[PDB]
Design a protein around this motif. Sequence first.
Motif, PDB file in Angstrom:
ATOM      1  N   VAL A 196      -8.205 -33.919 -11.267  1.00  0.00           N
ATOM      2  CA  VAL A 196      -8.146 -32.609 -10.617  1.00  0.00           C
ATOM      3  C   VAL A 196      -8.973 -32.665  -9.354  1.00  0.00           C
ATOM      4  N   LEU A 197      -8.498 -31.968  -8.345  1.00  0.00           N
ATOM      5  CA  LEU A 197      -9.238 -31.809  -7.108  1.00  0.00           C
ATOM      6  C   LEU A 197     -10.457 -30.894  -7.360  1.00  0.00           C
ATOM      7  N   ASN A 198     -11.659 -31.326  -6.941  1.00  0.00           N
ATOM      8  CA  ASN A 198     -12.897 -30.580  -7.243  1.00  0.00           C
ATOM      9  C   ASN A 198     -12.898 -29.224  -6.596  1.00  0.00           C
ATOM     10  N   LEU A 199     -12.293 -29.102  -5.434  1.00  0.00           N
ATOM     11  CA  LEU A 199     -12.489 -27.832  -4.710  1.00  0.00           C
ATOM     12  C   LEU A 199     -11.152 -27.333  -4.225  1.00  0.00           C
ATOM     13  N   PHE A 200     -10.203 -27.142  -5.131  1.00  0.00           N
ATOM     14  CA  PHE A 200      -8.884 -26.674  -4.736  1.00  0.00           C
ATOM     15  C   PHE A 200      -8.817 -25.232  -5.295  1.00  0.00           C
ATOM     16  N   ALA A 201      -9.712 -24.375  -4.810  1.00  0.00           N
ATOM     17  CA  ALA A 201      -9.780 -22.969  -5.266  1.00  0.00           C
ATOM     18  C   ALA A 201      -8.548 -22.094  -4.971  1.00  0.00           C
ATOM     19  N   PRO A 202      -8.174 -21.190  -5.912  1.00  0.00           N
ATOM     20  CA  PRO A 202      -8.723 -20.971  -7.242  1.00  0.00           C
ATOM     21  C   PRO A 202      -7.956 -21.716  -8.348  1.00  0.00           C
ATOM     22  N   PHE A 203      -7.311 -22.820  -8.005  1.00  0.00           N
ATOM     23  CA  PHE A 203      -6.531 -23.536  -8.980  1.00  0.00           C
ATOM     24  C   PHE A 203      -7.380 -24.482  -9.782  1.00  0.00           C
ATOM     25  N   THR A 204      -8.014 -25.466  -9.127  1.00  0.00           N
ATOM     26  CA  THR A 204      -9.023 -26.302  -9.802  1.00  0.00           C
ATOM     27  C   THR A 204     -10.362 -26.297  -9.032  1.00  0.00           C
ATOM     28  N   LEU A 205     -11.449 -26.151  -9.800  1.00  0.00           N
ATOM     29  CA  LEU A 205     -12.837 -25.927  -9.360  1.00  0.00           C
ATOM     30  C   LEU A 205     -13.689 -26.729 -10.384  1.00  0.00           C
ATOM     31  N   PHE A 206     -14.394 -27.748  -9.901  1.00  0.00           N
ATOM     32  CA  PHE A 206     -15.165 -28.644 -10.781  1.00  0.00           C
ATOM     33  C   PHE A 206     -16.341 -29.086  -9.914  1.00  0.00           C
ATOM     34  N   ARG A 207     -17.270 -28.147  -9.639  1.00  0.00           N
ATOM     35  CA  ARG A 207     -18.348 -28.367  -8.598  1.00  0.00           C
ATOM     36  C   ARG A 207     -19.476 -29.189  -9.205  1.00  0.00           C
ATOM     37  N   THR A 208     -20.359 -29.711  -8.347  1.00  0.00           N
ATOM     38  CA  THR A 208     -21.661 -30.174  -8.824  1.00  0.00           C
ATOM     39  C   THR A 208     -22.525 -28.911  -9.149  1.00  0.00           C
ATOM     40  N   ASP A 209     -23.133 -28.824 -10.334  1.00  0.00           N
ATOM     41  CA  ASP A 209     -22.713 -29.480 -11.554  1.00  0.00           C
ATOM     42  C   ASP A 209     -22.344 -28.292 -12.414  1.00  0.00           C
ATOM     43  N   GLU A 210     -21.053 -28.001 -12.446  1.00  0.00           N
ATOM     44  CA  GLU A 210     -20.542 -26.883 -13.170  1.00  0.00           C
ATOM     45  C   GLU A 210     -19.472 -27.428 -14.111  1.00  0.00           C
ATOM     46  N   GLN A 211     -18.996 -26.573 -14.998  1.00  0.00           N
ATOM     47  CA  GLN A 211     -17.833 -26.923 -15.771  1.00  0.00           C
ATOM     48  C   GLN A 211     -16.538 -26.742 -14.970  1.00  0.00           C
ATOM     49  N   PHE A 212     -15.440 -27.255 -15.509  1.00  0.00           N
ATOM     50  CA  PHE A 212     -14.166 -27.183 -14.892  1.00  0.00           C
ATOM     51  C   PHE A 212     -13.647 -25.742 -15.013  1.00  0.00           C
ATOM     52  N   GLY A 213     -13.128 -25.140 -13.949  1.00  0.00           N
ATOM     53  CA  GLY A 213     -12.651 -23.738 -14.022  1.00  0.00           C
ATOM     54  C   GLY A 213     -11.432 -23.575 -13.103  1.00  0.00           C
ATOM     55  N   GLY A 214     -10.898 -22.365 -13.006  1.00  0.00           N
ATOM     56  CA  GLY A 214      -9.752 -22.100 -12.147  1.00  0.00           C
ATOM     57  C   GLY A 214      -8.500 -21.773 -12.935  1.00  0.00           C
ATOM     58  N   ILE A 215      -7.478 -21.311 -12.236  1.00  0.00           N
ATOM     59  CA  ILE A 215      -6.193 -21.010 -12.860  1.00  0.00           C
ATOM     60  C   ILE A 215      -5.725 -22.180 -13.667  1.00  0.00           C
ATOM     61  N   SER A 216      -5.749 -23.366 -13.071  1.00  0.00           N
ATOM     62  CA  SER A 216      -5.132 -24.518 -13.720  1.00  0.00           C
ATOM     63  C   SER A 216      -5.906 -24.962 -14.943  1.00  0.00           C
ATOM     64  N   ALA A 217      -7.250 -24.788 -14.923  1.00  0.00           N
ATOM     65  CA  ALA A 217      -8.062 -25.026 -16.151  1.00  0.00           C
ATOM     66  C   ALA A 217      -7.573 -24.188 -17.365  1.00  0.00           C
ATOM     67  N   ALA A 218      -7.318 -22.894 -17.118  1.00  0.00           N
ATOM     68  CA  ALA A 218      -6.767 -22.060 -18.154  1.00  0.00           C
ATOM     69  C   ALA A 218      -5.369 -22.519 -18.560  1.00  0.00           C
ATOM     70  N   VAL A 219      -4.527 -22.891 -17.590  1.00  0.00           N
ATOM     71  CA  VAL A 219      -3.128 -23.324 -17.944  1.00  0.00           C
ATOM     72  C   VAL A 219      -3.159 -24.585 -18.835  1.00  0.00           C
ATOM     73  N   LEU A 220      -4.059 -25.518 -18.491  1.00  0.00           N
ATOM     74  CA  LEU A 220      -4.193 -26.758 -19.265  1.00  0.00           C
ATOM     75  C   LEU A 220      -4.645 -26.441 -20.716  1.00  0.00           C
ATOM     76  N   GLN A 221      -5.490 -25.439 -20.865  1.00  0.00           N
ATOM     77  CA  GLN A 221      -5.888 -25.061 -22.226  1.00  0.00           C
ATOM     78  C   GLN A 221      -4.700 -24.537 -23.035  1.00  0.00           C
ATOM     79  N   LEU A 222      -3.890 -23.668 -22.437  1.00  0.00           N
ATOM     80  CA  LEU A 222      -2.661 -23.221 -23.084  1.00  0.00           C
ATOM     81  C   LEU A 222      -1.738 -24.418 -23.409  1.00  0.00           C
ATOM     82  N   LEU A 223      -1.549 -25.352 -22.458  1.00  0.00           N
ATOM     83  CA  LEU A 223      -0.881 -26.653 -22.729  1.00  0.00           C
ATOM     84  C   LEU A 223      -1.444 -27.457 -23.930  1.00  0.00           C
ATOM     85  N   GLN A 224      -2.747 -27.460 -24.037  1.00  0.00           N
ATOM     86  CA  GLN A 224      -3.401 -28.123 -25.169  1.00  0.00           C
ATOM     87  C   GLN A 224      -2.912 -27.584 -26.503  1.00  0.00           C
TER      88      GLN A 224
END
Length: 235
Positions: free
Chosen positions: A22-50
């Motif tokens: 995932v791209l670290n700073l492709f807001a608001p789709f993927t967000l994975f900053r130093t040092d945070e957890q992974f977040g964004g629209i796509s983080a939620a979509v991947l959880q539903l995929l899981q």
Amino acid sequence: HPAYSAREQQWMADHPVVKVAVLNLFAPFTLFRTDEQFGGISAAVLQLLQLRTGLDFEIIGVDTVEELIAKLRSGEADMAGALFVNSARESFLSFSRPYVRNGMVIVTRQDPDAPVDADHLDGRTVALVRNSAAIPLLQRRYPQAKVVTADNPSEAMLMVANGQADAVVQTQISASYYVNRYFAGKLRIASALDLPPAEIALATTRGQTELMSILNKALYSISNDELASIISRWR
């Protein structure tokens, strides 16, 4: 819901943990900053995929799309969690069905000489992310607009804020995100662009018959109501 085939079932038994770049700073789709957890629209979509697949996802954050593609091509990552569908990449990537489809807009300064809308771009400098899929579409629709490039969406937004460009092209979603959070009072959404909507999808390399068919079935079983719920949180 999803109806997986025997080969797909085999693929999932051999890959219980799938490596998602995932791209670290492709807001608001993927967000994975130093040092945070992974977040964004796509983080939620991947959880539903899981839930739809039973797969665990190991997330690999990278800064640049060159990196993300290199990790797909080497097999270090199995799939990308969010990329723009881009026909110039179709010779080496496959994209899933889109899970976000969104019109693009121009963002300008709030000053009296700013382009009022996309029909007022003649001789104006429009910034886009380097290698953006929008670049040739914008050049054909608005041949009189002067295109400059930037490394990434932050730099592109900052070119407008600091006066190196009159306008920047973003999806409406990312534009509202960046404007409201960082440039309120300095930048504004001027109008929609007369260009096909951008689309966000998962991606794999072209070889990946089973995993892409798994992602498509699983995406298919996510309703538009579920997706809209997630996306509306990032306005």
